[PDB]
Each structure stands twice: as C-alpha cells, then as structure tokens.
Design a binder for this molecule. Structure first.
Ligand SMILES: CCCCCCCCOCCOCCOCCOCCO
Ligand SMILES: CCCCCCCCO[C@@H]1O[C@H](CO)[C@@H](O)[C@H](O)[C@H]1O
Ligand SMILES: CCCCCCCCO[C@@H]1O[C@H](CO)[C@@H](O)[C@H](O)[C@H]1O
Ligand SMILES: [N+]
Ligand SMILES: [N+]
Ligand code: NA
Length: 677
C-alpha cells in the first residue's frame, strides 16, 4: 500500500491508471483535476527512445526539437514554454537540481527508469520553483522481491553501441530486504562528423522493510559522460535557404576537433523513508545529494564572414564547473473522514540548496568554410575570463487537501516559498544578493460520473527566479505563471482505453524585456499560451495497441518593449499530432512476433522572435519489428529491430534564432537482444 509519494495503481502496455505527480499521493488519473500523461517502460522500449526528451515525442503539448538531434541535454518544451526548459525535470519526487544558468544540467539515462510522468501547467504549489508549462517526473526502477536478471545489448547505425545489465531480487528468506543493480556502457558517433557520444553508468539500490509500517530505500547513481555528442547550430541562411550557391549546409557539419570536449560526471545518492503511523497518519522523507563536474571546450559558428563569403565566423566557450546540491522533502499525510467528506490532507516542508563554482573562458576562433571545411586552425584569441560562485536556497512549506464527497473530487493547495539567490563574481569580487518569498495556490474540482466520464476545472500558479538582472545587477522579480484549465477524461470501466481533452489558458508575468537600444532589462514582459490537447490510449484485439495525440498551441508575447509584441515565440508549433501502434501475434505460426510503427507531425514554426522566417513543418515515420525467441525454446530471450525517422527526412527541426538552426536526427536503425534468467 503506502499511497504517500508513490504512483501505485497498475500499468498495462502503454497505459497507467494512477500517478502521484499532481498530488504527491497515489490518485487515479481519472480522478485528478490536472492534465497528466504517463509514458511506460514498454513505450520507452517499443519506440526505441534513447533519451528522456525523445521518450516524449508521442505525448501531446510537448515539442521535442529545441536543439534538434542533440542528446547532450533533455529539452522538454511544454505548452510552448522553451525558456529554461532544461529545468523541467524531477527525479523520484525531487528536482534534478542542475543550474540552468550554467552548463551543469544533469541527464538521467532512460535505462534506469520505470516510468515518466508529465504534469501540464503551473505546478509550484507542491514543487516550488518551476516553469509555467508543467514538469516531468522520472520514476527510477526499484528493487523487486523476486529474482530478475536481464542482460541487454544493442547495435545500430551512426556507430551506435550499447550494453547493459539489470539485476534485482531479495537478499533474505523473509523477502523484507531487496536489491537492484543496473549497469550501462554505451556510445555512438552522431550524424555529425568528428563527434562522439559515450556514457558509463551504475545505480545500486537497496530496500529494507523494517516492519509492516516502515520501508527505507537507499539509492546511488554514478554516471560519466566522457563525450557529450553535438550541441551546435548553424544559420538559417544556408539551412532554410541556399547560401551563395545551391550550397546548403550538411546535416553532418561540425566546429573544431582537438578543441572539442564535453566531460560530465554525475554522483547522486539519496534515500526514501516511508513510515505508516496509522491507517490515518503516514510520513515520508525523500532526500538526494548531487555532486557533478562539467568540463567544456567548444568552438561554434556565429554568423557568416563579412570577409570570406562561404566561411562562418566562430567563437569559443570553455567551462570548468563543479556543482553541489542538496534536496530534502518532508511529508506528513492524514487520511480521515468528516461525515460524508473523505480528506487526504498533506502538509510538507522541503529544502533545496545549490552551489555552483564556474570558471568560464571565451574567445574568437578561425573562420571555417561551411561546405568543404578544413580543420586544424584551433588557435583561440581569448577574451577576459569570467568566474562565478552561484548559490540558490529554497525553503517551501505547503499544505494540500484532496476532498472526495459523493462523486466530487476536490483539490485545495497552498504553498509558501522563501528563496535566496547569490552570485559572487570571483573575477571582480562583486556579490549580488536577493531574498524573497512567494505564495502559490491551486484549486481543482472534478465530477466522476459512474460511467467513467470526468469533467473538471482547475486553477494553478507557479513562480521561477528570473534569469535576468536590472542590470544594476540585482536579479529581477521572479516570473509568475497562472493557469485556468478545463478538461474531460474518459475511461470505460474494464477497458484498457483512456481518453482526455484539455483546454488551457496560461499567463506568464514579469518576463524580462528591454528596448533594443536599451541597457537595462525590465520585468514588464508578458506571455500568454492557450490551446487544446487531445490524447487517446486505445486497446483492441487483445494484441493491438494504439496511442494518439493532437495539440493546438497559441502562444504570444502579449506585452513586450522589444518590438515583438503580438508575435509568436520561435520553437512553438501551432499544431502537432502523433499516432503509434503495436500489433503482437500470441497464437499461430507467427507467435512471439511483434510489429509496430507510427507517425509524428510538427506544424510550421518561427525561426526567430521577430517572426520574419518560417521553419518548414515535418512528418516523420518510426517503425519496429520484434520477436520473442521464447517460442523456439530459448526462454526469456527476445530480439528487436527499430527505425526512427524511417524515410530519413533531412530537415531543420527548429531555430533558436536566424543564426542558430538545428538539424533533426537522421535515420536511426537499432537492433537489440534482451536476455532474462
Ligand atoms: C463540460 C464542462 C467542463 C469540461 C470541459 C472539457 C471539454 C473539452 O472539449 C473537448 C472538445 O473537443 C473534442 C474534439 O473531438 C474531435 C477532434 O476535433 C478537434 C480538432 O480541433
Ligand atoms: C473558467 C473560469 C475563468 C474565470 C475568469 C477569470 C476571473 C478572474 O480570475 C481570477 O484570477 C486571480 C488571479 O489570477 C485568482 O486569484 C482568482 O482565483 C480568479 O478568480
Ligand atoms: C481556457 C479556459 C479558461 C478561460 C480563461 C479565463 C480568462 C483568463 O483568466 C484571467 O485572465 C485575466 C486577464 O488575462 C487575468 O488577470 C486573471 O488572473 C486570469 O484569471
Ligand atoms: N554562459
Ligand atoms: N561572442
Ligand atoms: Na513558432
């Protein structure tokens, strides 16, 4: 049992029944007055999703192409909110604790995950600092109480290789103590020349039941990325149009080898303490400590040469970053009735503390020819170094009541945050400080008809520290999100099908804004995003599965001083849609055989804020083939073949600006062997 901080429920194929992402306590999706999606392990495997970001490509209201084919960082753009998207990720109920002002953003490998939950819209009432589009919660694999061993091996195009193991089971005869150990070695060249991706990782977990009332789970996670793939972009000039010839830049071009490093080491440890005091009272403590090192050397293009026509100007970023982060969450929950109302009453206290020590380097590099490049001119003319020590502290006190009365399901939430942010410039000695407090609230109401139909309304709020400063150096007031949401959910009792529609209106306040010829940013900007998301999980035939999604997003700068008032942010398609299907045969000569595939539509988008050039829309096809060799007398050994972007479309996924456009991933072919015993 133990609802507190756990999803529970069941999962079948691609469909989960319950989640805790919106409640911090197990609640059926059908009875939750928020838009929640769950991506199961199976879905992650079936679509051959290599990253958390790619796992999200069949979920509505999420755009997955912020830096195109890059896999260095997880960019999950929700309801159109691309800024600070890298900070959307929670792991096991706790913020990842990276610093989106630095290069020190963490990445969790999907191999270690049981599920991915997605919460749309402002959600600070239970989490604190966060973005107005929503948040993502990763649930790691946990120790199983029966023996489970799996070895996995994979090989594909682009020099893709991966090997992993996954071992779990009990350690005593009474099954009160259990362990899990997951390992991973993997690598890939990219579609990009002179680029490499490489990762090694291990995660030990240990669960100990003390009594019927207490479980303690201890977790470690150690990950080393000696190479971080590609994190570059090139001008719209030679990608969305020709440049100086029919010359268009290849989907394979680079910056400078011999000065191309990205080394990221992540060391996490934590525990989850679950104690039931009563059938009424339960308590939980989630704790995670993170220590990471990032080392970066990157020469990159910035515009065309004014001198040499088919050459790009290049610049250099270098970084040595050490991040230390503590997060704890303390929860107390009472479940009780007051006459005809059932209350699930949660009070909590959470604490985040982060310290980032950064040494930044910058300079100018040699110009490079975009078509037919000559490498080896790696001399840099360095600019003044920039060294900082960044600190962030957040203390939150929150209270929630989930009230069930008759068919009504109500949600009431209140939270108070104290945030302290420091920036010491170690090059100049100057120190910026800022302390403030924010209240946030949420009210939700849902009606559960006994046919499985649930309409609902929700009001929700968020805040996030402002990335920009008055430029007098103090940070600006934190941004604020406010959402009204109307939704409809449907599950047919008994059916493994689930349908939802979500209508949303989000306002983001205090966004930084300035006149183009102004020095000082000011916090008077405003962004509004409204739209509709439709999502369907359909089961038929006992062996045909289906996923469908449609998204409409109207996001606008409703208030700006920069001359882009009324405009639509770049990287925000008005329309997206997807569909996936998987057919298995369980009887006949084709037994143990699986076939699946799907398609993904991303509407046209703006290349630039100033809305002067469009990035073409695109439709991509994914396919898979699998076979359980168990049917041939090889028990627990099965084989998969995957292909994403099957038609191998060469396209620009998105652009950060007219100077930085990103190529989508080329065809990815993958073949995997899994062995249980
Ligand atoms: C009933 C009061 C509160 C509940 C509000 C939820 C209503 C959500 O509306 C969904 C209506 O859209 C259904 C679309 O079905 C066909 C697809 O067409 C959509 C293309 O624009
Ligand atoms: C679907 C119902 C929409 C109601 C129309 C909005 C009326 C004013 O909206 C108000 O906004 C305030 C701050 O954003 C909140 O504190 C209030 O709860 C809300 O009533
Ligand atoms: C998507 C269905 C919900 C209807 C949206 C209600 C209208 C927007 O909501 C209201 O808008 C006002 C002006 O933007 C704000 O001042 C209020 O805080 C906000 O509650
Ligand atoms: N930076
Ligand atoms: N620069
Ligand atoms: Na756009």
């Amino acid at each position: 049992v133990f609802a507190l901080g756990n999803n529970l429920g069941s999962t079948d194929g691609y469909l989960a029944t319950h989640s805790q992402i919106a409640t911090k306590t197990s609640k059926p999706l059908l009875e939750t007055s928020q838009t929640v999606s769950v991506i199961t392990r199976e879905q992650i495997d079936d679509t051959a999703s290599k990253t958390v970001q790619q796992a999200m490509r069949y979920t509505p209201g999420i755009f997955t192409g912020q830096v195109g084919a890059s896999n260095r960082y997880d960019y999950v753009v929700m309801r159109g909110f691309a800024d600070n998207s890298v900070d959307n990720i929670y792991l096991d109920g706790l913020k990842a604790m990276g610093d989106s002002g630095t290069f020190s953003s963490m990445q969790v490998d999907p191999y270690f995950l049981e599920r991915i939950d997605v919460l749309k819209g402002p959600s600070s009432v239970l989490y604190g600092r966060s973005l107005p589009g929503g948040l993502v919660a990763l649930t790691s694999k946990k120790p199983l109480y029966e023996d489970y061993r799996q070895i996995t091996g994979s090989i594909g195009n682009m020099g893709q290789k991966e090997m992993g193991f996954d071992f779990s089971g009990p350690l005593d005869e009474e099954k009160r103590i259990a362990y899990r150990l997951i390992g991973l070695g993997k690598g890939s060249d990219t579609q990009f020349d002179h680029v490499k991706e490489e990762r090694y990782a291990i995660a030990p977990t240990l669960a100990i039941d003390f009594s019927d009332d207490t479980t303690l789970t201890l977790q470690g996670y150690l990950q080393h990325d000696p190479n971080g793939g590609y994190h570059g972009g090139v001008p719209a000039d030679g990608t969305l149009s020709h440049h100086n010839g029919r010359h268009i830049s290849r989907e394979f071009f680079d910056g400078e080898p011999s000065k191309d490093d990205f080394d990221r080491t992540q060391r996490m440890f934590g525990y989850q303490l679950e104690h039931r005091i009563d059938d009424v009272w339960s308590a939980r403590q989630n704790f995670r400590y993170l220590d990471s090192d990032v080392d970066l050397s990157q020469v990159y293009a910035y515009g065309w040469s004014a001198s040499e026509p088919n050459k790009l100007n290049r610049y250099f970023s270098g970084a040595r970053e050490h991040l230390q982060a503590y997060i704890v969450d303390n929860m107390l929950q009472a479940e009780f009735a007051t006459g005809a109302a059932r209350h699930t009453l949660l009070t909590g206290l959470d604490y985040q503390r982060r310290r980032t020590v950064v040494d930044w380097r910058s300079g100018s590099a040699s110009a490079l020819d975009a078509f037919n490049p000559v490498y080896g001119d790696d001399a840099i003319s360095y600019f003044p170094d920039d060294n900082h020590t960044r600190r962030l502290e957040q203390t939150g006190v929150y209270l929630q009541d989930l009230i069930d009365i008759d068919q009504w399901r109500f949600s009431l939430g209140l939270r108070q945050d104290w945030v302290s942010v420091t920036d010491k410039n170690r090059s100049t000695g100057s120190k910026a400080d800022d302390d403030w407090e924010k209240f946030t609230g949420r009210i939700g109401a849902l009606y559960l008809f006994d046919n499985g139909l649930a309409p609902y309304v929700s009001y929700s709020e968020s805040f996030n520290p402002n990335a920009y400063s008055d430029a007098s150096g103090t940070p600006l007031a934190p941004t604020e999100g406010k959402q009204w949401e109307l939704g409809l959910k449907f599950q047919a009792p008994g059916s493994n099908s689930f349908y939802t529609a979500s209508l949303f209106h989000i306002t983001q306040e205090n966004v930084a804004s300035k006149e183009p010829q102004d020095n000082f940013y000011t916090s008077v900007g405003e962004v509004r995003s409204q739209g509709l998301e439709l999502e369907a999980h359909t089961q038929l035939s006992d062996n045909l599965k289906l996923l469908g999604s449609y998204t409409y997003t109207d996001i606008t700068y409703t208030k700006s001083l920069d001359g882009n008032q009324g405009h639509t942010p770049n990287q925000a398609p008005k329309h997206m849609a997807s569909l996936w299907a998987d057919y298995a045969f369980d009887a006949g000569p084709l037994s143990g055989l699986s076939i699946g595939g799907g398609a993904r539509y991303v509407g046209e988008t703006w290349a630039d804020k100033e809305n002067t050039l469009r990035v073409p829309d695109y439709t991509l096809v994914d396919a898979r083939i699998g076979y359980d060799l168990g049917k041939l007398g090889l028990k627990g050994l099965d084989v998969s073949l995957n292909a994403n972007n099957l038609l191998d479309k060469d396209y620009v996924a998105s652009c950060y600006s007219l100077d930085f456009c990103y190529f989508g991933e080329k065809r990815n072919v993958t073949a995997t062997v899994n062995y249980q015993f």
